[PDB]
Design an enzyme around this catalytic site. Structure first.
Site, short mmCIF file in Angstrom:
data_model
loop_
_atom_site.label_atom_id
_atom_site.label_comp_id
_atom_site.label_asym_id
_atom_site.label_seq_id
_atom_site.Cartn_x
_atom_site.Cartn_y
_atom_site.Cartn_z
N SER C 107 1.25 -1.55 -0.22
CA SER C 107 -0.34 0.18 -0.41
C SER C 107 1.31 1.59 0.06
O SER C 107 2.45 1.68 0.79
CB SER C 107 -0.63 -0.34 1.48
OG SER C 107 -1.48 1.10 1.44
N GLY C 108 0.56 2.29 -0.20
CA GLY C 108 1.16 3.79 -0.69
C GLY C 108 2.86 3.64 -1.90
O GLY C 108 3.18 3.68 -2.39
N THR C 112 -1.74 2.69 -7.66
CA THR C 112 -2.39 3.74 -7.96
C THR C 112 -2.40 4.53 -9.83
O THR C 112 -3.35 4.66 -10.36
CB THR C 112 -3.16 5.11 -7.55
OG1 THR C 112 -3.52 4.59 -5.97
CG2 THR C 112 -3.93 6.17 -7.28
N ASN C 157 -0.98 1.53 7.43
CA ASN C 157 -0.44 2.57 6.69
C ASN C 157 -2.21 2.94 6.97
O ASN C 157 -3.03 2.24 7.13
CB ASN C 157 -0.30 1.98 5.04
CG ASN C 157 -0.10 3.37 4.28
OD1 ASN C 157 -0.22 4.46 4.55
ND2 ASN C 157 -1.05 3.72 2.70
N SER C 160 -5.12 1.36 3.49
CA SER C 160 -4.87 0.14 2.95
C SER C 160 -6.16 -0.36 1.67
O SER C 160 -7.02 -0.70 2.93
CB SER C 160 -4.36 -0.39 4.04
OG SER C 160 -5.30 -0.88 4.76
N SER C 161 -5.72 -0.84 0.87
CA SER C 161 -7.34 -1.27 0.36
C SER C 161 -7.33 -3.34 0.66
O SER C 161 -6.60 -4.10 0.55
CB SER C 161 -7.31 -1.50 -1.14
OG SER C 161 -7.30 -0.13 -1.57
N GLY C 389 -0.99 -6.92 -1.13
CA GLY C 389 0.63 -7.57 -0.52
C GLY C 389 0.24 -8.53 0.71
O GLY C 389 -0.59 -8.68 1.38
N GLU C 391 1.32 -10.02 4.14
CA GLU C 391 1.08 -9.13 5.40
C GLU C 391 2.01 -9.08 6.11
O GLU C 391 1.04 -10.20 7.18
CB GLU C 391 -0.39 -8.80 5.40
CG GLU C 391 -0.99 -7.11 6.29
CD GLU C 391 -2.32 -7.07 6.02
OE1 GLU C 391 -2.97 -6.55 4.62
OE2 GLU C 391 -2.96 -7.14 6.92
#
Ligand code: ADP
Ligand code: ADP
Ligand code: MG
Ligand code: MG
Ligand code: MG
Lengths: 148, 372, 720, 361, 371
Positions: C107-108, C112, C157, C160-161, C389, C391
């Site tokens: 995430s980040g 995107t 984060n 986070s999706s 991702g 984790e």
């Protein structure tokens, strides 16, 4: 060995050599050997010229006679660098293989790599490599013009 | 008779009774009181509200059958009075106030059992003199030995009492509430595997009669289980009272094996062979050898074929091998406690040890805790 | 391409299969650092793009770059997102099988941006660019709506999706973008009703409470403090400074408008979100039969207004299990545990269904207006997939266990496809498969999923077994049944040396991304999804337009018991896998170079974790196979023919025999190369780098011959 | 596919289905009708009952009639569940103290008539714990043919404390066929047992104090209720509504000697060791159809509170799904991951014959 | 961590914790239970055996055994299960980190120490361990250098006389009678009221009757008269199934077996004569100093009235001028522990522990040179 000069070829070479003599001393400058050979349509490298000049510069004086000019001429006449080799050599500098090279990419390799064109000689090359002024040279056509 | 001693071994499954000086009991009857289930209709009959002993057991089909004694404890005193009344009036045919009466008990019993046996024997049957023996001490009087360890095995109690040279050893006494009634209630469960649903208190007595005739002790239980699982020759047919021929197979030696493996019945206690050895190696400084030489077997669940050879084999595997393990199984060992009480109550020296009717007037029912 | 190999000392290798010590992760991260310092953010592992986030507006995405990467094969150019973009489009126009692109990363990490920029290449270059730009804007303007309902703050984060987002662009036989599709997979729906410490619920609830008109909340539970609701506050994390929930709501409310939700459909949808809040505040007590009953009426007073169901029916559904047998229906009452699980199963189900309904409402707004049905010529989809991702936290739990099993199963698929893709070429070219040994993902998926002995089948039993059941009794059964396995460990199974690192009430899996340690506390509470037919039969009767569409009458026919969350996740994951086995996946793997969100800082301590979580070293191992390099003899000969006298300027015959004389002049030893049916193979990049370094000196002679010819021609032009 | 079948053949109804379900798919009476087709089975026979001699192949949990029990398994698999049994391992049920031939011949018929891949036989009161969610408790299963008690503690059975009573719902039908003749209603044929069973299943309840309901019915008509027969004759019933379920508490009404279902439960708890009893008194599970009377858990609590010491808390677990609880527990067991190691395979049946069930189950 | 473990293994309860603690962290019965019955609920996760409070919870399905009987370890597989459970489940510490002080009774077999030593070094790999005599530890729990200790545990009763730190080993006297033999006598005399206890799970019920109801009669023949003539001494106990026991003279006929071992069938004299013959077997001018200093410890010294009867009885044997005192500390059930935590914190005894180096040099016979 490979060939021996005809009296008519010796006469053409002497006639061209007479423009570099001019005053009647019958002798040409050690670097100017390249200029008379190039006037006679030969394609010698500076390394080839220096490697032959090393056998005649040994007493100083700065110039060479007609018999040894005629000998160094007969040495390079064994293996003048031919159209298909020159074309395929440009094909190594072409980044796409598309058959054209940009004025900037040619200006780069001709100033960077062995025996180097000076910027004046590069501008003089570009002046008739950029034939119709779009900024690209078709090297496959340019080589057949250059090797005629 | 003048005052010949009554001897009443009111055992948990059979009342055994007679007079001291006789070879064996006169009265031997099932210790059962029975009362009718279905209502009477034949108005001309003299129908009784209750039946006792043979009167109940020859009529078992129409009666619900109850024992007064469970595990040597008199659980129902009225059914008990009805059984002693039956013993004196109907079976021996004598007034109890005219005869001094020896009673028997299992060891380690509840103390209110001796007291109430005493109280009823004076305040009801008016006995002139009374004493409450211990059954395993009587099987030595019967055996003509001062020394032995007695395995006594009744309907409701199994017990081991070591006596050496006339002295009992009350720390070494073992009791196991597992005997002929527990083996009968487990044969009722075994026989369900061939679908025989014995369930009434009447059919409990049918399963008891199979246990008395076809059951036996395996000399090696896993060897007989492997033999019954691979041959027909151990099976026996039994004819039920209406004419149905049952068949019994491994079911006949798996029932007595519960004396050697009480875990079959769901008990945690050890087998009768371990309970014997665990009592001999509870004994004092000198005596352990002479008890291995005198294992005396007594009471009806010691009657099974193969039980002496099994007990000899199982104790020989626990005891030090220089010892002679010798097991005493006389043919009369079903009456041994009664024969024993017939010797005791006949003894010229015993006659001061009776509780007398006078002593029960000077001190209450606790007198049997002093005199025995 | 080999033109870059002269600069390999500053610019790095372009494709990591050429990095000589290929088993060294320290060399992999060094070649990433070498490139990222040089602003070269894109690198391959064969066809797989590895990308590292620049945190800068590098100019490389402009229209002048797109047409540079359009219609050019991906290894004849430098690596870029558009080299993956073009290759994926050409495979669609030419094989006419469906194509996918897994965008992967932290995430980040820039996922995107890769999705926004791929949807720029397929808009700004395709033969219907006006409809393509409309489909881009409808695909991208959906983001605030899906991000509010499917992202949450974690320990790692702020945004986070928690779901696998999918986005197609739909193309006709002409290569016109006709429309799109959206789908959403493997949502962490456990997060609706339980959060770990330092983590929030899905963003919409705090958006709704922090930002909203008083008359909008006054129809609902109107207390502005998010601590008021048991489903918002378990993580203790509700207020945070990095998340401006008031501004995020004002953006999202306008995104719902602009996405074509009519105002009443938003009022329905807010009423579902507020119904999920109120479901959390229901308190049961046991009457004297140990049977659960609702004590508090104020939640139900609003749940009838908001869920649109009858209050007497919702009271019954939360407290009784209906069974149907011999045509009679039997209401068996629930205990306090089962009634809590019924309330939380209903919240997880109401929420994962309004989210699936937002995705349908959006997807039906991307679909084509045309009939698209035979004798219509053909249609083909090109998709972007964006699943979470690997984790690893301080305290891993049932959510991480599912996320990491998902990533294990996707790594398994990917390494099977990479191995197949190499082996099919070794067979085609006639090279012996020199056998690589690589981390076998099969063993660790069989540990998790095997039918009557995997961790999930043991955990499914612990929710179904009679008697009192605990997370520690589950672990004590893993310790008995998994026992000798090589990738499984616990404090009991650990030797005295390793037993210092591992607590009681934990187990450890060796994953492709290294060991991960799972705390069992909460596994049984999180795995239970007791949605009884009685609750669905209530919900299908709702006056609320969303709940009516979410709980269809046909679902009530199913006579199976409720499946557990790990079993639903296993089943849904294996359906995501068969969608990716049938489809053709490209891959993009994204690296976040520092956690500060900073230009130029490359933090190897962080990048080592991502390079490990992305499995890049295992992919390099398999893709490198036995040989670092292979190229067609025509392409290899026309490059290096200047080195061997016989091949210069033109070879005498068949190119394979021209290479067979050229590599003898270059003196390649018999194990350094192989001669396949139409490619030369080179075993170590040593041999290739030396050959491009022979060509780099040979350029001096080639330029000399050109200049000599010019200086000859110069005189005959300038005079006479 | 390859899910397990779960099948509770017990006495009166077959309950059958798969291990995955909430509740059974096949629920039909364990009946073969023959003409008074050459035979009819289950709901087909119960519908055509005027022309038939209805025979039940199980009596008191024992299969008495193997040819008609093969027809009921054939109708179970091929008409009601509509599956080939060769694809599915099968969990059968049985009563505790049953004959050994009943298991042997169940096992032979599953492997040699239905070719089942693997099978198991489980005790009904044991299965009825799983449906209750418990591993400690005493379970009173009471079906059509058998009432039995299995005590269980921490998931260990006490097999010496098992109690079985050959008296349940069929003996209550056949006693309601006796006591209704005192109102001049005649019910004699096998088809009339079904009509009187349908009376028992609608009008009967367990009195909380029988001798006070007796006096209440003698005083006034408030206990009388009515039932229209399938020819529109109306039967009115009163005192006979609680006399029939009293025969569980008083097996003397039917001429047996056994103690009631309350004392048979207490006498299992007393066969259990002192430590266990407090947990059994709090966990009296009930299952099967004769536990379904209104008032029966209230009477069972009242009667066991009078036997058990006054400091014990007595609780009786009587779920609404009592009838299906044996089968529901079979669905749970055949689903367990640990249980899949415990099926008898046809490969073990080839080594050991029908005898294998006594080693495995 | 580096702190010593202590394990007072004694016959009935295990006691364990760290040196420098006040009291044990583990206190649980020294039992291993194994299932007696047919396991029937599949998926339960039932264990092959249960230890301590697990076995004492699940009693009705288990055959309970104690490996220690009369202070002697009779079953090493069960004792290794008790020690594994002690370290791993109760204390939750690796034994390889901690030096371990074990305790045992005087006049035990020499095999019992050798096999303790072997299991602590070869099965639990402790760095160092020691064996200490329980009644020495109980003396030094009291903050005394001089005294005689009566140490009635669960399985053995010993007297050790110690004068200014020197034990008098010829005046050690051991009696193989204690609280387990009292539970077994209470099972015997409870059957006189009609109650029957026979299973090992019921022996633990009768033990709990004995700890709650029993007390020591200051004159046995006077409490016998008061119990034979009134209801004033009778008390009741509620069983697990809610049945109510009542007992009277059974409350003090059981504890009186300490003063009259002939009730249990033994010839050896009571704890008062055993104490006094240990004091009189000592040197004439150290007797005055032991009469002033009778420490008592272990749980079978816990009865109400036992210090008073012991003080009455030694005053009856001793010279009329002797000042008898009996030191019965309220915590005397833990004095062997408290002693073991103190006489393992001492800086002067950190050189007394047997190291695994000295075990490798000599095998398990190292304990007899050291202890
Ligand atoms: N021959 C036998 N074989 C086996 N069991 C027998 C035999 N004879 C008697 N029994 C059993 O012994 C028990 C009766 O023994 P008995 O000593 O008379 O009992 P008790 O003294 O307690 O009344 C009954 O259970 C009976 O079935
Ligand atoms: N509502 C009811 N009230 C009373 N008895 C019932 C009721 N429902 C069913 N029964 C009786 O229960 C018995 C069937 O119970 P069941 O659990 O199916 O036993 P089984 O499996 O042996 O067939 C029948 O005798 C039937 O009449
Ligand atoms: Mg007898
Ligand atoms: Mg049935
Ligand atoms: Mg101890």
């Amino acid at each position: 060995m490979a060939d021996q000069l005809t009296e008519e070829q010796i006469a053409e070479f002497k006639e061209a050599f007479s423009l570099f003599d001019k005053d009647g001393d019958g002798t040409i400058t050690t670097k100017e050997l390249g200029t008379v050979m190039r006037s006679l349509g030969q394609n010698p490298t500076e390394a080839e010229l220096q490697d032959m000049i090393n056998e005649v510069d040994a007493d100083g004086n700065g110039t060479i006679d007609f018999p040894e000019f005629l000998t160094m001429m007969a040495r390079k006449m064994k293996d003048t660098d031919s159209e298909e080799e020159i074309r395929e050599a440009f094909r190594v500098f072409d980044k796409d293989g598309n058959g054209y090279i940009s004025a900037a990419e040619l200006r780069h390799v001709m100033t960077n790599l062995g025996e180097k064109l000076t910027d004046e000689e590069v501008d003089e090359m570009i002046r008739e490599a950029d034939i119709d002024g779009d900024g690209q040279v078709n090297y496959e056509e340019f080589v057949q013009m250059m090797t005629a | 008779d003048e005052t010949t001693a009554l001897v009443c071994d009111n055992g948990s499954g059979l009342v055994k009774a007679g007079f001291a000086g006789d070879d064996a009991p006169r009265a031997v009857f099932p210790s059962i009181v029975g009362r009718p289930r279905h209502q009477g209709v034949m108005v001309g009959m003299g129908q009784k509200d209750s039946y006792v002993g043979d009167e109940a057991q020859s009529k078992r089909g129409i009666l619900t059958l109850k024992y007064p004694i469970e595990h040597g404890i008199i659980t129902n005193w009225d059914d008990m009075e009805k059984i002693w009344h039956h013993t004196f009036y109907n079976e021996l045919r004598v007034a109890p106030e005219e005869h001094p009466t020896l009673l028997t008990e299992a060891p380690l019993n509840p103390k209110a059992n001796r007291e109430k046996m005493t109280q009823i024997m004076f305040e009801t049957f008016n006995v002139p003199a009374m004493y409450v023996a211990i059954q395993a001490v009587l099987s030595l009087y019967a055996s003509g030995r001062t020394t032995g360890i007695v395995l006594d095995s009744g309907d409701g109690v199994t017990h081991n009492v070591p006596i050496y040279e006339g002295y009992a050893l009350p720390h070494a006494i073992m009791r196991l509430d597992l005997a002929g009634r527990d083996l009968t209630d487990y044969l009722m469960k075994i026989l369900t595997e061939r679908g025989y649903s014995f369930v009434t208190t009447a059919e409990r007595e049918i399963v008891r009669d199979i246990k008395e005739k076809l059951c036996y002790v395996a000399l090696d239980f896993e060897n007989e289980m492997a033999t019954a699982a691979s041959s027909s020759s151990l099976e026996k047919s039994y004819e039920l009272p209406d004419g149905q021929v049952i068949t019994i197979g491994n079911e006949r030696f798996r029932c007595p094996e519960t004396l050697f493996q009480p875990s079959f019945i769901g008990m945690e206690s050890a087998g009768i062979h371990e309970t014997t050895y665990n009592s001999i190696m509870k004994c004092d400084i000198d005596i352990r050898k002479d008890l291995y030489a005198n294992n005396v077997m007594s009471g009806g669940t010691t009657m099974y074929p193969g039980i002496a050879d099994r007990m000899q084999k199982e104790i020989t595997a626990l005891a030090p091998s220089t010892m002679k393990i010798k097991i005493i199984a006389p043919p009369e060992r079903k009456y041994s406690v009664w024969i024993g009480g017939s010797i005791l109550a006949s003894l010229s020296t015993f006659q001061q040890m009776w509780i007398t009717k006078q002593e029960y007037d000077e001190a209450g029912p606790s007198i049997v805790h002093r005199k025995c | 391409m080999e033109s870059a190999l002269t600069a390999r000392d500053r610019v790095g290798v372009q494709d990591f299969v050429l990095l000589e010590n290929f088993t060294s992760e320290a060399a992999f991260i060094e070649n990433l650092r070498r490139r990222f310092r040089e602003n070269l953010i894109y690198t391959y592992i064969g066809p797989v793009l590895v990308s590292v986030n620049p945190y800068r507006d590098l100019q490389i995405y402009s229209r002048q770059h797109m047409e540079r990467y359009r219609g050019v094969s991906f290894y004849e150019v430098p690596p870029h997102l558009f080299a993956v973009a073009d290759t994926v489009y050409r495979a669609l126009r030419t094989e006419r099988r469906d194509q996918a692109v897994m965008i992967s990363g932290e995430s980040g990490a820039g996922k995107t941006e890769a999705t926004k920029r791929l949807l720029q290449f397929y808009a700004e270059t395709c033969p219907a660019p006006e409809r393509g730009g409309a489909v881009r804007d409808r695909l991208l303007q959906s983001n605030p709506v899906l991000e509010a309902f499917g992202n949450a703050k974690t320990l790692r984060n702020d945004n986070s999706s928690r779901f696998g987002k999918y986005m197609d662009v739909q193309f006709d036989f002409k290569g016109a973008p006709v429309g799109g599709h959206i789908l959403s997979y493997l949502l962490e729906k456990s997060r609706v009703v339980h959060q770990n410490h330092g983590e929030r619920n899905f963003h919409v609830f705090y958006q709704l409470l922090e930002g909203g008109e008083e008359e909008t909340l006054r129809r609902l539970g109107l207390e502005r403090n998010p601590q008021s609701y048991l489903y918002l506050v378990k993580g203790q994390c509700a207020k945070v400074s990095s998340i401006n929930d008031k501004s995020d709501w004002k953006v999202m409310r306008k995104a719902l408008s602009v996405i074509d939700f009519t105002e009443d459909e938003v009022e329905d949808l807010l009423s579902i979100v507020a119904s999920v809040l109120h479901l959390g505040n229901i308190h049961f007590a046991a009457d004297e039969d140990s049977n659960a009953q609702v004590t508090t009426e104020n939640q139900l007073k609003y749940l009838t207004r908001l869920l649109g169901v009858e209050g007497t029916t919702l009271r019954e559904a939360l407290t009784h299990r209906k069974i149907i047998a011999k045509g009679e229906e039997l209401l068996s009452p629930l205990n306090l545990e089962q009634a809590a699980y019924a309330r939380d199963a209903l919240a997880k189900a109401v929420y994962s269904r309004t989210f699936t309904w937002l995705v349908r409402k959006i997807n039906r707004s991307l679909a084509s207006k045309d009939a698209e049905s035979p004798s219509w010529r053909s249609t083909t989809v090109l998709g972007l997939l964006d699943i979470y991702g690997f984790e690893v936290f301080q305290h891993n739990s049932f959510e991480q266990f599912c996320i990491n099993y998902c990533n294990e199963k996707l790594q398994q698929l990917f390494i099977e496809l990479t191995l197949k893709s190499e082996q099919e070429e070794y067979e085609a070219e006639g090279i012996a498969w020199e056998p690589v040994q690589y981390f076998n993902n099969k063993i660790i998926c069989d540990l998790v999923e095997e039918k009557f002995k995997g961790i999930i089948s043991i955990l499914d039993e612990e929710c179904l077994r009679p008697g009192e059941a605990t997370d520690l009794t589950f672990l004590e059964k893993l310790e008995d049944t998994v026992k000798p396995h090589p990738h499984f460990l616990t404090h009991k199974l650990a030797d005295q040396k390793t037993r210092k690192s591992l607590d009681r009430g934990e187990f450890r899996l060796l994953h492709y991304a290294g060991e991960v340690t799972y705390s069992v506390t909460g596994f049984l509470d999180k795995n239970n999804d007791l949605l009884f037919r009685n609750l669905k039969e209530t919900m299908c009767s709702s006056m609320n337009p969303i709940m009516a569409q979410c709980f269809d009458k046909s679902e009530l026919s199913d006579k199976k018991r409720p499946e557990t969350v790990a079993t639903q996740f296993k089943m849904s994951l294996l359906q995501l896998v068969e969608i990716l086995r049938s489809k053709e996946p490209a891959y993009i793997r994204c690296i976040k170079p520092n956690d500060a969100k900073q230009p130029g800082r490359f933090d190897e301590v962080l990048i080592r974790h991502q390079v490990k979580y992305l499995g890049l070293m295992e992919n390099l191992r398999v893709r490198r196979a036995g040989f670092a390099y292979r190229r067609k003899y025509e392409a290899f000969l026309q490059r290096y023919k200047s080195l061997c006298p016989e091949t210069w300027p033109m070879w005498a015959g068949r190119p394979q025999d021209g290479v067979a004389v050229l590599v003898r002049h270059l003196g390649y030893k018999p194990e350094e190369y192989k001669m396949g049916r139409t490619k030369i193979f080179i075993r170590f990049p040593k041999t290739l780098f030396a050959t491009e370094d022979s060509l780099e000196v040979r350029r001096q002679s080639l330029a000399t011959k050109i200049q000599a010819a010019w200086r000859g021609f110069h005189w005959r032009q300038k005079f006479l």
